[PDB]
Design a protein around this ligand. Structure first.
Ligand SMILES: [Zn+2]
Lengths: 367, 37, 120, 20, 106
């Protein structure tokens, strides 16, 4: 009966001019301590940057647009060029075009085109900032080495997805990749294999001028695990809760499950493991419309998911049996749109929800 | 009988999920600590 | 059923599934039988059982074991393992025996072998 | 392997009898 | 680099997985079956007569692997089964076995 642990209040509410629905938001978790909390937003043909200040003073630091085509950005992902420590924002969607924007120079540093449909999610390898994972609608998930502009591996094939790969997530240590698709399946590709080390090292040590042969991208046709009995529908977003798995479907709930039986170690799981045991389901209301990813803070203390009506749920994961408890529902009479995505700052003090009415919302923890 | 067996199974499942959650939380603590470092 | 209180009457009486569950519980309480002959654990079986795996899982059309192009659901009677393609049973016995020990070296072994083969 | 030719003949003899 | 060759890596992995996914098969027999399938896919034999030479090529490429795996008896069992399926011959079996023995002596 505990009323959760975190209480939030709405301190600001922005609105993009383009008025088209904005889909993704990503705080720059690579900013140093004391650096102003910069977060990015993607929606329609425009990607906008903002800087969070005291009392909700959100400053529109930068803004970009791709008006030469009909690009509709779907997701954003933050990284940094380790050579110069410049923060880098990776954006994609609709066109399947990956743009690595450099907010320092306000220029699109790199462009990547190998995907055959809209890219629905971009994530970066937690250990390696140059490894960008793109889950697209072409039934494939690719791994790019943006440091050398190479395709490290393609994670689709004979045993890959049979529909759009809606979202994907890295392990906390960045070793196993979980991908949720529109084919109701959640295949667990493993970047821990010696093949993955070989591919990553070769991509890092690949010079196009040295050899005429192209880079031999690895084709991981067979996932190290796969299941279809978790969700009766497609899986929008997936997230690694340490060694557990969090996934969400059209069933108005996010279930926490684990590959194998209850005593089956994730690392020591055979690819043919046909058993999956679920642990608990976080039950919310009115989230039937698809493609509303959730997010958890860096410490994974808590996670938050948006809603189609306008509510915002956040659950505390420190509480014993997190499937229990009643969460904290953040509401506002002026928030009637559908929250496409949420994001937490590196310190989980600012929770920002981007709605489907191009209206950004900022929430701060009362503490 | 059947009720006792069901209660025992439910209790065992509850302790199992609690222990799994605690172990996953410890792993999360270690991994987040090294990531922050 | 195990906790209570041999596996049908008492179980059906207590539970009432019910009678069907009790009957099922009462009933309840390599697979090829061809161990690898290269490995130490290896028994002795006839050639129809020591080669059944090779015969069943080979495609004569593509010369590959369990080929993808041609699929058989084992509907036929073991797909006629190797059929009778060894029709060329004609062979010639030659002189110059194996060496110090040979059937041809031993007197009468050849005739005994011929008589045994001539059982018909 | 091993199984001299005389031994092979003896084995064959032993295997005889017994059983649009 | 026409980038389209006879045996794609995914096909080889699928063949290995399918062979190892059988229940009624010995371990060494599965190993020799997988080796033969990989050899056939790598060389793409389509002719019965070539199959004869194929067997020799096997001991020219997988002889050391079979000797190390110590599945020579399973290999000769496979040769006998192939002879039963027609193609190859008694002379072919003898030549292949002798070449395999020469590999061990080497
Ligand atoms: Zn075939």
């Amino acid at each position: 009966s505990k009323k959760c642990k975190y209480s939030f209040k709405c301190v600001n509410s922005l609105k993009e001019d383009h008025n088209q629905p904005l889909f993704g938001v990503q705080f720059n978790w690579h900013s140093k301590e004391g650096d102003p909390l910069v977060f990015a937003t993607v929606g329609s043909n425009r990607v906008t940057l903002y800087e969070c200040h005291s009392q909700g003073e959100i400053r529109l630091l930068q803004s970009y647009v791709d008006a030469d085509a009909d690009e509709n950005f779907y997701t954003c992902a933050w990284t940094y060029d380790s050579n110069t420590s410049h923060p880098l924002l990776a954006v994609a969607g609709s066109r399947g075009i990956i743009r690595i924007i450099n907010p320092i120079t306000m220029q699109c540093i790199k462009h990547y085109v190998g995907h055959g449909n809209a890219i629905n999610e971009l994530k970066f390898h937690p250990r390696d900032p140059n490894l960008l994972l793109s889950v697209s609608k072409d039934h494939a998930l690719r791994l790019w080495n943006i440091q050398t502009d190479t395709l490290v591996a393609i994670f689709g094939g004979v045993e890959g997805h049979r529909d759009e790969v809606l979202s994907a997530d890295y392990d906390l240590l960045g070793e196993k990749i979980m991908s949720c698709g529109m084919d109701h399946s959640l295949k667990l590709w493993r970047i821990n294999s010696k093949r993955m080390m070989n591919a990553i090292k070769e991509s890092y040590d690949y010079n196009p001028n040295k050899t005429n042969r192209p880079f031999i991208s690895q084709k991981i046709h067979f996932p190290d695990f796969s299941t279809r009995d978790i969700h009766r529908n497609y899986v929008d977003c997936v997230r690694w809760l340490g060694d557990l798995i969090l996934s969400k479907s059209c069933e108005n709930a996010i279930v926490c499950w684990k590959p194998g039986k209850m005593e089956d170690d994730i690392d020591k799981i055979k690819p043919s493991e046909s058993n999956v045991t679920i642990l608990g389901r976080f039950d919310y209301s009115q989230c039937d419309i698809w493609y509303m990813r959730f997010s958890m803070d860096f410490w994974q203390k808590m996670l938050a998911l948006g809603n189609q009506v306008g509510k915002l749920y956040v659950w505390d994961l420190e509480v014993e049996d997190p499937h229990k408890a009643k969460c904290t529902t953040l509401t506002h009479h002026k928030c009637g749109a559908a929250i496409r995505q949420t994001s937490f700052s590196r310190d989980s003090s600012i929770l920002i929800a981007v709605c489907d009415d191009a209206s950004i919302w900022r929430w701060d923890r009362l503490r | 009988e059947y009720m006792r067996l069901r209660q025992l199974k439910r209790f065992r499942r509850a302790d199992e999920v609690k222990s799994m959650f605690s172990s996953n939380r410890q792993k999360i603590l270690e991994r987040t600590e090294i990531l922050n470092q | 059923v195990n906790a209570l209180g041999d596996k049908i009457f008492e179980a059906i009486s207590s539970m009432f599934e019910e009678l069907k569950e009790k009957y099922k519980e009462l009933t309840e309480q390599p697979p090829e039988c061809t161990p690898n002959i290269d490995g130490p654990n290896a028994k002795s079986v006839q050639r129809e059982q020591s080669l059944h795996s090779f015969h069943t899982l080979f495609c004569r059309r593509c010369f590959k074991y369990d080929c993808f192009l041609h699929r058989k659901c084992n509907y036929s009677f073991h797909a006629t393992p190797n059929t009778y393609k060894r029709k060329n049973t004609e062979t010639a016995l030659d002189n110059k025996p194996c060496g110090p020990q040979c059937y041809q070296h031993l007197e009468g072994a050849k005739e005994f072998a011929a008589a045994l083969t001539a059982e018909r | 392997g091993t199984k001299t030719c005389r031994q092979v003949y003896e084995f064959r003899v032993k295997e005889s009898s017994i059983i649009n | 680099d026409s980038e389209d060759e006879k045996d794609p890596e995914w096909l080889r992995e699928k063949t290995i997985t399918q062979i190892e996914e059988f229940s009624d098969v010995n371990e060494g027999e599965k190993e020799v079956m997988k080796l033969w399938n990989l050899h056939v896919m790598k060389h793409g034999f389509i002719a019965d007569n070539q199959m004869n030479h194929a067997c020799m090529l096997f001991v020219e490429n997988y002889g050391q692997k079979i000797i190390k795996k110590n599945l020579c008896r399973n290999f000769m069992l496979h040769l006998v089964s192939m002879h039963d399926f027609n193609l190859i011959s008694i002379m072919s079996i003898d030549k292949a076995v002798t070449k395999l023995r020469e590999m061990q002596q080497k």
